[PDB]
Amino acid sequence: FDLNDFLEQKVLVRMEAIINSMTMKERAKPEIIKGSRKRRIAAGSGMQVQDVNRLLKQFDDMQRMMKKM
RNA sequence: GGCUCUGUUUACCAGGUCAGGUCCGAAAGGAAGCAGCCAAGGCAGAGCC
Ligand SMILES: [Cl-]
Ligand SMILES: [K+]
Ligand SMILES: [K+]
Secondary structure: OOHHHHHOOOHHHHHHHHHHOOOHHHHHOHHHOOHHHHHHHHHHOOOOHHHHHHHHHHHHHHHHHHOOO
């Protein structure tokens, strides 16, 4: 389960925007998204770093639920 | 070495464009700009000088 699958799942549009700012490698392997990548994605989606942190955490909550079932 | 062709490769960190999204504006309209793409660079093979 990756961010390409989470994309297919005003608040919903803003979340899709953050993923639209990522590279295919970032969508395929979300763990590589550290500080510098979060800043590029944030500014690129017109959001703040906190909004990227929230989206990545919401993905991690979903990924951990998919790993349980 | 140079030029060109071809393959491939490259998140941001002074190229272009810019879906999505963002910012300014009551509007009309403006602005910046990620990803992608183009271009460019990297690694090579080849042809020519
Ligand atoms: Cl080349
Ligand atoms: K761009
Ligand atoms: K650009």
